[model samples]
Target: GAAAGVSAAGIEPDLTAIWQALFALPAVGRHQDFFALGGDSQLGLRMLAQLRERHGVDLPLRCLYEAPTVARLAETIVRLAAPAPSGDQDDASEYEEGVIR
Candidate 1:
């Protein structure tokens, strides 16, 4: 799933654009964190939807909660672009293990 975001090696996403698109505001250097500037789950979902529509990438909704800062989120995005093994139902199972919704 993550591999879907990769177009080439050593290529990083322009998270500043993503942030501005999600919030409809300019991204100053000080505006780096997702939550510090009134971000919430609702906004996160909106951001995720925009990213999916724009980049064809499906980032986990939990990503924003776990890594709210632009730097951390960028790292997470890079990590998520790696190819994972197939036939590993165990991995998805873990994500769904305790999920109720």
Candidate 2:
């Protein structure tokens, strides 16, 4: 029912095209977990390769294992791909490390 709902509304993953191109696997049910959908280490490598080729983001292959869900993985991609913040000054290391001087 949820799958139908998502499909009917055309609400697919933003990276759907890349996913299909890289995996060549069946369009899995939206509720399906990556492992349940036949993902493995080999597929993980393929996914990392595709992410690099398509998004220009150099995510390590381990991310696939760490964040297996699409939503979580997408969040990681955004977090990893985001530009670093500019301007920062925090020498709290001394306080946190308990080195008062």
Candidate 3:
């Protein structure tokens, strides 16, 4: 399974395709806004689920609202998918144990 992770170059194109498919558009430009294309919060939640299934990234709904355009959203996904610093590794175990404090 070489290259299991996605490349930065592929993120925007993939997201553009997803947006096009979700919105039923012939093509969705990277800069096109999701809400401008008539994507309400409900549709946004559906998109979020699709994104999680495709990339295994658990993004909060607010992230979609914050980064409305495919380009911006793609950038956000890349940043989130990055490996976390070792300093935060402890939190991973804490979360798995169902305890945050």
Query: What TM-score, over all chains together, does every model reach?
Result: 0.51, 0.50, 0.54
lDDT agreement with native, every candidate: 0.55, 0.53, 0.56
Clashes of each: 0, 0, 0
Task: Sort the predicted structures by lDDT, highest score first.
Answer: 3, 1, 2
* Sliding window of 10 residues with minimal summed lDDT for model 2: 1-10
**Clashing residue pairs, candidate 2?**
none
Per-residue lDDT over 3-88 for candidate 1, one digit per residue giving the tens place of the 0 to 100 score: 12212234335875666555655342433666654367666656666666666565554666787577777788778782322221
Model 2 score (lDDT) = 0.53
lDDT of 3 by residue, 1-101 (tens): 11222222334457766656656655655656666643576666566566556655555445557986667767886876733222211111322555555
Could you give the C-alpha RMSD of every candidate to the true structure, in order shown? 12.7, 16.6, 12.2
Best by TM-score: 3
Q: Which ten residues in a row have the lowest lDDT in candidate 3?
A: 84-93
**Model 3's lDDT to the true fold?**
0.56
